[PDB]
Design an enzyme around this catalytic site. Structure first.
Site, PDB file in Angstrom:
ATOM      1  N   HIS A   7      13.347  11.316 108.548  1.00 29.53           N
ATOM      2  CA  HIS A   7      12.442  12.346 108.042  1.00 29.53           C
ATOM      3  C   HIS A   7      12.493  13.586 108.919  1.00 29.53           C
ATOM      4  O   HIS A   7      12.459  13.489 110.148  1.00 29.53           O
ATOM      5  CB  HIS A   7      11.009  11.808 107.967  1.00 29.53           C
ATOM      6  CG  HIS A   7      10.786  10.859 106.837  1.00 29.53           C
ATOM      7  ND1 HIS A   7       9.581  10.751 106.186  1.00 29.53           N
ATOM      8  CD2 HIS A   7      11.625   9.990 106.227  1.00 29.53           C
ATOM      9  CE1 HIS A   7       9.686   9.856 105.219  1.00 29.53           C
ATOM     10  NE2 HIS A   7      10.916   9.379 105.224  1.00 29.53           N
ATOM     11  N   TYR A  21      -0.547  13.374 105.271  1.00 31.78           N
ATOM     12  CA  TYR A  21      -1.768  13.039 106.006  1.00 31.78           C
ATOM     13  C   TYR A  21      -2.831  13.932 105.350  1.00 31.78           C
ATOM     14  O   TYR A  21      -2.667  15.141 105.317  1.00 31.78           O
ATOM     15  CB  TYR A  21      -1.624  13.414 107.496  1.00 31.78           C
ATOM     16  CG  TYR A  21      -0.779  12.477 108.350  1.00 31.78           C
ATOM     17  CD1 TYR A  21       0.598  12.636 108.449  1.00 31.78           C
ATOM     18  CD2 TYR A  21      -1.371  11.450 109.087  1.00 31.78           C
ATOM     19  CE1 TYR A  21       1.365  11.798 109.262  1.00 31.78           C
ATOM     20  CE2 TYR A  21      -0.605  10.607 109.906  1.00 31.78           C
ATOM     21  CZ  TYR A  21       0.756  10.791 109.985  1.00 31.78           C
ATOM     22  OH  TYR A  21       1.496   9.970 110.802  1.00 31.78           O
ATOM     23  N   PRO A  32      -3.732   4.539 115.052  1.00 37.38           N
ATOM     24  CA  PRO A  32      -2.460   4.720 114.331  1.00 37.38           C
ATOM     25  C   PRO A  32      -2.099   6.115 113.807  1.00 37.38           C
ATOM     26  O   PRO A  32      -0.948   6.345 113.451  1.00 37.38           O
ATOM     27  CB  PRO A  32      -2.533   3.697 113.197  1.00 37.38           C
ATOM     28  CG  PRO A  32      -3.996   3.349 113.094  1.00 37.38           C
ATOM     29  CD  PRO A  32      -4.512   3.420 114.478  1.00 37.38           C
ATOM     30  N   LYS A  53       2.099   6.299 117.448  1.00 43.83           N
ATOM     31  CA  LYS A  53       2.609   6.111 118.815  1.00 43.83           C
ATOM     32  C   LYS A  53       2.604   4.705 119.425  1.00 43.83           C
ATOM     33  O   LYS A  53       3.299   4.473 120.407  1.00 43.83           O
ATOM     34  CB  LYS A  53       1.875   7.057 119.786  1.00 43.83           C
ATOM     35  CG  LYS A  53       2.002   8.522 119.453  1.00 43.83           C
ATOM     36  CD  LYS A  53       3.441   8.966 119.610  1.00 43.83           C
ATOM     37  CE  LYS A  53       3.659  10.365 119.090  1.00 43.83           C
ATOM     38  NZ  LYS A  53       4.835  10.398 118.172  1.00 43.83           N
ATOM     39  N   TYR A  89       4.836  14.935 117.850  1.00 36.25           N
ATOM     40  CA  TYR A  89       5.076  13.992 116.773  1.00 36.25           C
ATOM     41  C   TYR A  89       6.430  13.310 116.869  1.00 36.25           C
ATOM     42  O   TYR A  89       6.522  12.093 116.691  1.00 36.25           O
ATOM     43  CB  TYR A  89       4.891  14.657 115.403  1.00 36.25           C
ATOM     44  CG  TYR A  89       4.666  13.664 114.290  1.00 36.25           C
ATOM     45  CD1 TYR A  89       3.394  13.166 114.020  1.00 36.25           C
ATOM     46  CD2 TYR A  89       5.739  13.171 113.546  1.00 36.25           C
ATOM     47  CE1 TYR A  89       3.197  12.193 113.035  1.00 36.25           C
ATOM     48  CE2 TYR A  89       5.554  12.210 112.568  1.00 36.25           C
ATOM     49  CZ  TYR A  89       4.290  11.724 112.313  1.00 36.25           C
ATOM     50  OH  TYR A  89       4.136  10.790 111.317  1.00 36.25           O
TER      51      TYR A  89
HETATM   52  C1  LIG Z   1      -2.168  -0.148 110.651  1.00 34.09           C
HETATM   53  C2  LIG Z   1      -1.242   0.134 111.852  1.00 34.09           C
HETATM   54  C3  LIG Z   1      -0.301   1.079 111.746  1.00 34.09           C
HETATM   55  C4  LIG Z   1       0.552   1.361 112.802  1.00 34.09           C
HETATM   56  N1  LIG Z   1       1.473   2.289 112.639  1.00 34.09           N
HETATM   57  C5  LIG Z   1       2.304   2.603 113.637  1.00 34.09           C
HETATM   58  C6  LIG Z   1       3.528   3.512 113.398  1.00 34.09           C
HETATM   59  O1  LIG Z   1       3.777   4.061 112.305  1.00 34.09           O
HETATM   60  N2  LIG Z   1       4.321   3.776 114.553  1.00 34.09           N
HETATM   61  C7  LIG Z   1       4.014   3.252 115.813  1.00 34.09           C
HETATM   62  O2  LIG Z   1       4.674   3.523 116.820  1.00 34.09           O
HETATM   63  N3  LIG Z   1       2.915   2.353 115.936  1.00 34.09           N
HETATM   64  C8  LIG Z   1       2.128   1.998 114.928  1.00 34.09           C
HETATM   65  N4  LIG Z   1       1.250   0.972 115.069  1.00 34.09           N
HETATM   66  C9  LIG Z   1       1.202   0.045 116.310  1.00 34.09           C
HETATM   67  C10 LIG Z   1       2.130  -1.102 116.618  1.00 34.09           C
HETATM   68  O3  LIG Z   1       2.163  -1.926 115.430  1.00 34.09           O
HETATM   69  C11 LIG Z   1       1.758  -1.892 117.848  1.00 34.09           C
HETATM   70  O4  LIG Z   1       1.701  -0.991 118.924  1.00 34.09           O
HETATM   71  C12 LIG Z   1       2.847  -2.888 118.209  1.00 34.09           C
HETATM   72  O5  LIG Z   1       2.765  -3.993 117.286  1.00 34.09           O
HETATM   73  C13 LIG Z   1       2.767  -3.461 119.619  1.00 34.09           C
HETATM   74  O6  LIG Z   1       3.773  -4.431 119.901  1.00 34.09           O
HETATM   75  P1  LIG Z   1       3.591  -5.455 121.110  1.00 34.09           P
HETATM   76  O7  LIG Z   1       4.867  -6.162 121.138  1.00 34.09           O
HETATM   77  O8  LIG Z   1       3.172  -4.709 122.290  1.00 34.09           O
HETATM   78  O9  LIG Z   1       2.551  -6.619 120.316  1.00 34.09           O
HETATM   79  P2  LIG Z   1       2.102  -7.234 119.246  1.00 34.09           P
HETATM   80  O10 LIG Z   1       2.808  -6.763 118.050  1.00 34.09           O
HETATM   81  O11 LIG Z   1       0.647  -7.499 119.133  1.00 34.09           O
HETATM   82  O12 LIG Z   1       2.685  -8.665 119.594  1.00 34.09           O
HETATM   83  C14 LIG Z   1       2.234  -9.395 120.735  1.00 34.09           C
HETATM   84  C15 LIG Z   1       2.671 -10.863 120.585  1.00 34.09           C
HETATM   85  O13 LIG Z   1       2.173 -11.679 121.627  1.00 34.09           O
HETATM   86  C16 LIG Z   1       1.669 -12.888 121.114  1.00 34.09           C
HETATM   87  N5  LIG Z   1       0.638 -13.451 121.965  1.00 34.09           N
HETATM   88  C17 LIG Z   1      -0.701 -13.130 122.009  1.00 34.09           C
HETATM   89  N6  LIG Z   1      -1.365 -13.934 122.845  1.00 34.09           N
HETATM   90  C18 LIG Z   1      -0.402 -14.789 123.376  1.00 34.09           C
HETATM   91  C19 LIG Z   1      -0.466 -15.828 124.277  1.00 34.09           C
HETATM   92  N7  LIG Z   1      -1.595 -16.117 124.925  1.00 34.09           N
HETATM   93  N8  LIG Z   1       0.675 -16.521 124.504  1.00 34.09           N
HETATM   94  C20 LIG Z   1       1.777 -16.139 123.940  1.00 34.09           C
HETATM   95  N9  LIG Z   1       1.943 -15.191 123.045  1.00 34.09           N
HETATM   96  C21 LIG Z   1       0.814 -14.524 122.829  1.00 34.09           C
HETATM   97  C22 LIG Z   1       1.155 -12.547 119.760  1.00 34.09           C
HETATM   98  O14 LIG Z   1       1.190 -13.670 118.860  1.00 34.09           O
HETATM   99  C23 LIG Z   1       2.138 -11.492 119.308  1.00 34.09           C
HETATM  100  O15 LIG Z   1       3.224 -12.169 118.671  1.00 34.09           O
HETATM  101  C24 LIG Z   1       0.438   0.645 114.020  1.00 34.09           C
HETATM  102  C25 LIG Z   1      -0.510  -0.370 114.112  1.00 34.09           C
HETATM  103  C26 LIG Z   1      -1.297  -0.656 113.072  1.00 34.09           C
HETATM  104  C27 LIG Z   1      -2.307  -1.775 113.277  1.00 34.09           C
END
Ligand SMILES: Cc1cc2nc3c(=O)[nH]c(=O)nc-3n(C[C@H](O)[C@H](O)[C@H](O)COP(=O)(O)OP(=O)(O)OC[C@H]3O[C@@H](n4cnc5c(N)ncnc54)[C@H](O)[C@@H]3O)c2cc1C
Ligand SMILES: Cc1cc2nc3c(=O)[nH]c(=O)nc-3n(C[C@H](O)[C@H](O)[C@H](O)COP(=O)(O)OP(=O)(O)OC[C@H]3O[C@@H](n4cnc5c(N)ncnc54)[C@H](O)[C@@H]3O)c2cc1C
EC number: 1.14.13.2
Lengths: 392, 392
Positions: free
Chosen positions: A72, A201, A293, A297, A385
């Site tokens: 995009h 948006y 969200p 980021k 952005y």
């Molecule tokens: C509606 C929405 C829209 C979004 N849109 C965007 C976007 O367009 N662009 C963007 O950059 N971000 C966006 N985000 C954010 C992004 O989805 C999260 O920042 C991202 O998922 C983080 O990844 P992570 O690996 O840090 O953890 P998570 O995805 O939460 O994964 C962490 C993992 O650790 C596991 N875990 C938890 N506790 C334990 C434990 N005790 N033992 C072992 N495993 C455990 C969990 O099961 C999970 O699998 C959005 C979020 C939402 C909710």
């Protein structure tokens, strides 16, 4: 069992860190609380920065992304009867963003790990971290009733907001900064062609609305709702009617609606913890910080944390420069705070806040008018952005 | 589903609170992460205060305790070749303590709940608390793949040190006080007759040792070990030899040893959080504070928290005096800090600390000599050991 780097959580953060490290010859084990299926059910992100895109290429997991991802070059903001487009490519100096779902990124990473033969233990229950300040930390967990111990040199806490990692650091050693917003986002995933080739948006009096997508035949829509709402109180019918009500007429009449594949409410919050490490434990992604969200980021900050941790771990193992790991938090927090400020700003100018006086409403509107009408204002939105540059 | 008081955790805290409330006509639901079996496998406590004993009688679960419990009127401290007995009954003004295992107390409470027909959901996965500051808070959890919602007026977080309750309160609203000791306790449960009719706490140069019991044919022994020890590195044979080495010869030669039913290492720590409530959430037991096992106060402080919460909830439901709940933390913290100070004192005079200079060793020894030889010193140990009075 023993490994070099123990990773808690198989979401994008841990899988990406684990892919990069494995590729560089550093053995790592990933411990995940749930099942591959549960992980693959989370819709979440849709927008990726160029830095995230290059990091996936470096990890060797970009084939499908390069093929199915949509690049995009602009986004649109609709307010007060107007629809303004921000040319990201032109205003940021040629940079763009890529639309590719987080489910896809996760699936690609899971397949690459599966094939590499690197260790992954799902359904690892009751994970506990030990001797974080020692020279030999270890992780204990339960697999089919039996409690195993995993020895390692370092532990990367990539377990998200509710993970065990952040909880394992003495509370008195961390300083938390948090802001909880009085509204959440009701998202709806549909198998329909998106209403625009770019994202929209929208600030509307009834509240915020967002028109996003995943591909040419799959859309993702969101509407701002109070924290008191229940997803079951929102039929597809009710969602579409409300969405239509918040969009420009010309946009609303071109909308192809349809039954939902997924519907859920994500509450909004800003959260940062300082520092992001303790002894041999380093936090990454949602385990360390949460951004609303609105600025897209979250996943992207997870990527820069991971890129920083990986590169510092390389110097430690490859070059015997372990002292550099002490710089982890300082390097990351710099990028985190700027992305938090932008996500906070976007959230404040695009949403309807409860109990807002006349002066504030006018200032919110004026913020949009100024920033969307000034070449300098547009550039501040664009560079933020597409994503601010990774520090070295 | 709806209830009046939602309780997280089916350990002694939640079960006792739930029994008392049910008895008073206040409906409550208990949500437990694990299985009844897992709960019943934890050995833990053996010493109960008179206040805990009366609270169990009030809850109508004292039959088996009144029968099988052992009432102790004194304890013994052994140091520098001497063995001094503290007459608790005489020095505290007639008060005594009761030896009855925590497993038994838990089993009695579980059976009483089972029979009453009150709700208990085991294997309640992924418990999350919501709208804590609202007038209608709720709990969401997963039972056999399906996520249920439980509505309630109040939530009692009785989920222990690693529970979700304390984590659900905004970090910036809590002030944590913690001390981690550089040693743990290696405990061994055996089906043998105890070496004494009373407990023997021993300060020895090799480290601390404790001779406890559960009944006339079941003993519980402990020895201080560094945090680097692994339970598998300690055979029954090695434990008995070490224990014998830390006790007075006359005691060591009367020791009946035997194979272990249970062996484990519990690390020592002091931990307090202030306040102990947030909106409609109230913390109790290990969810709010941890005391080193040396003073035998953990379970007992859980009891006074529960007695206070129950009595305040009664005034709220029965007398419509909900404003009183605001006093929860102030009332409890008063008793908690005094029991923490005593557990800390006991721990410091009975254990061998790493890197202790000549002056400190002499002061530790002198503390014992003074307190065990002064009628006023003995009384300070006795009144604190039997348990300071519950506040009204
Ligand atoms: C509606 C929405 C829209 C979004 N849109 C965007 C976007 O367009 N662009 C963007 O950059 N971000 C966006 N985000 C954010 C992004 O989805 C999260 O920042 C991202 O998922 C983080 O990844 P992570 O690996 O840090 O953890 P998570 O995805 O939460 O994964 C962490 C993992 O650790 C596991 N875990 C938890 N506790 C334990 C434990 N005790 N033992 C072992 N495993 C455990 C969990 O099961 C999970 O699998 C959005 C979020 C939402 C909710
Ligand atoms: C070696 C040792 C000796 C001790 N000796 C004594 C003694 O002699 N006298 C004394 O007074 N104290 C003693 N104590 C302390 C006492 O055992 C604890 O204080 C007591 O167990 C606390 O009870 P609780 O109900 O607060 O929690 P716990 O016993 O920890 O139970 C909490 C429950 O909540 C559950 N839970 C956790 N997370 C969740 C979740 N997310 N969802 C739902 N459920 C959840 C857990 O499974 C657990 O069942 C001793 C402790 C030890 C370790």
């Amino acid at each position: 069992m023993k490994t070099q780097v123990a990773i808690i959580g198989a979401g994008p953060s841990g899988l990406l860190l684990g892919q990069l490290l494995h590729k560089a010859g550093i053995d790592n084990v990933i411990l995940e609380r749930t099942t591959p299926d549960y992980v693959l059910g989370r819709i979440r992100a849709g927008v990726l920065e160029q830095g995230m895109v290059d990091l996936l290429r470096e990890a060797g997991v970009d084939r499908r992304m390069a093929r199915d991802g949509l690049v995009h070059e602009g986004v649109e903001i609709a307010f007060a009867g107007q629809r303004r487009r921000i040319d990201l490519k032109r205003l940021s100096g040629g940079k763009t963003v890529t639309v590719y779902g987080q489910t896809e990124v996760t699936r690609d990473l899971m397949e690459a790990r599966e094939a590499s033969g690197a260790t992954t233990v799902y359904q690892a229950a009751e994970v506990r971290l030990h001797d974080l300040q020692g020279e030999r930390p270890y992780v204990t967990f339960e697999r089919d009733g039996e409690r195993l111990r995993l020895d390692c040199d370092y532990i990367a806490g990539c377990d998200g907001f509710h993970g065990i990692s952040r909880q394992s650091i003495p509370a008195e050693r961390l300083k938390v900064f948090e802001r909880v917003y009085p509204f959440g986002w009701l998202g709806l995933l549909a198998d329909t062609p998106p209403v625009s080739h770019e994202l929209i948006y929208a600030n509307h009096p009834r509240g915020f609305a967002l028109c996003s997508q995943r591909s040419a035949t799959r859309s993702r829509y969101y509407v701002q709702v109070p924290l008191t709402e229940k997803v079951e109180d929102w039929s597809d019918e009710r969602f579409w009617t409300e969405l239509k009500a918040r969009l420009p007429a010309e946009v609303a009449e071109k909308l192809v609606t349809g039954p939902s594949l997924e519907k859920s409410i994500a509450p909004l919050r800003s959260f940062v913890v300082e520092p992001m490490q303790h002894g041999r434990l380093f936090l990454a992604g949602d385990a360390a910080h949460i951004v609303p969200p609105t600025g897209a980021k979250g996943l992207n900050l997870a990527a820069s944390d991971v890129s920083t941790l990986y590169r510092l771990l390389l110097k430690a193992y490859r070059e015997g420069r372990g002292e550099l790991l002490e710089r982890y938090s300082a390097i990351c927090l710099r990028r985190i705070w700027k992305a938090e400020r932008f996500s906070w700003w976007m959230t404040s100018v695009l949403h309807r806040f409860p109990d807002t006086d006349a002066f504030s409403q006018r200032i919110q509107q004026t913020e949009l008018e100024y920033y969307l009408g000034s070449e300098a204002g547009l550039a501040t939105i664009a560079e933020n952005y597409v994503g601010l540059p990774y520090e070295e």
